[PDB]
């Protein structure tokens, strides 16, 4: 039906607009950019004026 074809087009647009793989890739890229590791020393003396 014409209404069904329009609904299929809207669903394709929604699937394009609702990926979340880009969000997952951005989160992974941010984590890789961070690359953290701490607590090896007990009293990390953050002495500042």
């Amino acid at each position: 039906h014409v209404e069904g074809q329009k609904l299929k087009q809207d669903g394709d647009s929604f699937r394009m607009k609702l990926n979340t793989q880009e969000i997952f890739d951005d989160w992974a890229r941010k984590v890789q950019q961070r690359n953290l590791g701490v607590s090896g020393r007990i009293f990390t003396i953050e002495s500042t004026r």
Binding site: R41, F43, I45, S47
Partner: peptide, 28 residues
């Protein structure tokens, strides 16, 4: 009778503790 002389109970200052800590941090 050995009046007083009870060792003068005292401790290092907080600034002194921080300074010894800074020396240890240099030594860390």
């Amino acid at each position: 009778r050995k009046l007083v002389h009870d060792k003068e109970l005292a401790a290092e200052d907080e600034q002194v503790f921080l300074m010894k800590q800074q020396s240890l941090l240099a030594k860390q």
